[PDB]
Design a protein around this ligand. Structure first.
Ligand code: JH1
Length: 282
């Protein structure tokens, strides 16, 4: 079926939970043996969210190459994404090592450091120009260059230096700051505006390594971001845009990381975002 009318048909019939459970039943199951090794317990935020072995990002280190991060490679859309958890106190250095080694231009953050009174990820970037951060375990230096605070999101320019080679690179930090503590946003308008700002920066384009996108577990909000982006790109590429099937795209993405889209409300919100976004594109 088309999307907008399939949408109204699920609303009128109140069957979002049943649609979402079908997706959960059909989703791929692949091994994640490296994630479950005992030496990696303090590298995982949640025991039930792990990268598959076949698609995990490897750190370029011989001691321990593990990080909780997955490469989502979308062949028809010609887009790639790295989806990862919010960094932990003992993985902030690994996080920036990955950004460096994978040649990413942008980092997309969809959570606040504290939500619901609890810490959802480490304070992993510097908050003042004159107070830079040094990650001694991976030999990197990170400096805040500029910050632009808007009503729904903040954009930061950062300098990442590899202290071993003295090479430097400019990294863009796109921080969506207004996702509610409970539920999903009422309108997708500010989320779509944010997606378009990431696109306009070059961070999603083939001349750079894959964008790095995270929230607390790296599957829920993060899944919503890449699902909406890929669906809208496919609607621009194909002769028949009504042929784009959001449930099929989501199942393709779940071949590369488990659990993408965590609730039926997030599924409905993803439909809403793609529907409204397709009208603005034209
Ligand atoms: C009219 C001149 N102009 C150039 C840009 C530009 O560089 N856009 C890409 C970009 C986005 C966010 C960043 F932080 C840095 C770079 C915007 N206006």
């Amino acid at each position: 079926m088309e999307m907008e009318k399939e949408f109204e048909q699920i609303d009128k019939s109140g069957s979002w939970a049943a649609i979402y459970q079908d997706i959960r039943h059909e989703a791929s199951d692949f091994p994640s043996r490296v994630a479950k090794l005992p030496k990696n317990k303090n590298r995982n935020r949640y025991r039930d969210v792990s990268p598959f072995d076949h698609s995990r990002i490897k750190l370029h280190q011989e001691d321990n190459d593990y990080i909780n991060a997955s490469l989502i490679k979308m062949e028809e859309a010609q887009r790639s994404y790295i989806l990862t958890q919010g960094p932990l106190p003992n993985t902030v250095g690994h996080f920036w090592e990955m950004v460096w080694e994978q040649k990413s231009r942008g980092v997309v953050m969809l959570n606040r450091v504290m939500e619901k009174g609890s810490l959802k990820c480490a304070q992993y970037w510097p908050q003042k120009e004159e107070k830079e951060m040094i990650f001694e375990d991976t030999n990197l230096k990170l400096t805040l260059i500029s910050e632009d605070i808007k009503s729904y999101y903040t954009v930061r320019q950062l300098e990442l230096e590899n202290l071993t080679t003295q090479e430097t690179r400019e990294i863009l930090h796109f921080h969506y700051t207004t996702w509610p503590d409970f539920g999903v946003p009422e309108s997708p308008a500010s989320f779509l505006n944010f997606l378009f700002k990431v696109r306009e920066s070059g961070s999603l384009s083939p001349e750079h390594g894959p964008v790095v996108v995270h929230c607390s577990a790296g599957i829920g909000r993060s899944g919503t971001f890449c699902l909406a982006d890929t669906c809208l790109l496919l609607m621009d590429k194909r002769k028949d845009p009504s042929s784009v099937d959001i449930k099929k795209v989501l199942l393709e993405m779940r071949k590369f990381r488990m659990g993408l889209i965590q609730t039926a409300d997030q599924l409905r919100f993803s439909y809403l975002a793609v529907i409204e976004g397709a009208k603005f594109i034209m």
